[PDB]
Design a protein around this ligand. Structure first.
Ligand code: ZN
Ligand code: ZN
Lengths: 10, 172
């Protein structure tokens, strides 16, 4: 499964 | 660069950022443990619980007794997992997620039903529906404060409505 990295200040 | 540009930047359950798993048939994204069942990180292509429910639904009135009598076969297993996820998708459910604070005869919280259902500790649907209802029973037993009492009433109605909608139970 593909993954990613998100952030509140991004 | 964004590995999954056509997929969400926040989880579908808790609506927060972080390490997200991306579905390969719809644009949803889930934390590793916010999805139910927990994401099989090495499955390609991975479809989320909403797509698997759609596949089952369009290719599969009932009585509540008969539904509860059913053994936890992969369909019923996935429906219950989806019902519990639908409960998780409401903010009020955070009150019932962790192990509570007090002593009842048998405490029960959301994460423990997640764990038991994950380890397939239920042989029939009645076990899962019974632990879910046991959460609200104990809440109506130990808490009298008006705000949290109304809160548990609302979460109860949410579980029961999602329960009768997903398993297609008859009114009247
Ligand atoms: Zn999907
Ligand atoms: Zn999440």
């Amino acid at each position: 499964a593909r993954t990613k990295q998100t952030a509140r200040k991004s | 660069s964004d590995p999954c540009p056509e997929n969400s930047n926040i989880c579908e359950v808790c609506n927060k950022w972080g390490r997200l798993f991306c579905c390969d048939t719809c644009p949803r994204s889930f934390h590793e443990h916010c999805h139910i069942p927990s994401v099989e990180a090495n499955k390609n292509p991975w479809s989320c619980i909403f797509c698997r429910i759609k596949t089952i639904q369009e290719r599969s009135g009932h009585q509540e007794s008969e539904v509860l009598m059913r053994q936890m076969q992969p369909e019923e297993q996935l429906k219950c997992e989806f019902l519990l996820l639908k409960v998780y998708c409401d903010s009020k459910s955070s009150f019932f997620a962790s192990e509570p604070y007090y002593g009842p005869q048998k405490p029960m919280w959301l994460n423990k039903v997640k764990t038991s259902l994950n380890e397939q500790m239920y042989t029939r649907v009645e076990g899962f529906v019974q632990d879910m209802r046991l959460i609200f029973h104990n809440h109506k037993e130990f808490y009298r404060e008006d705000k949290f009492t109304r809160l548990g009433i609302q979460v109860q109605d949410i579980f029961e409505k999602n329960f009768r909608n997903i398993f297609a139970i008859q009114e009247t």
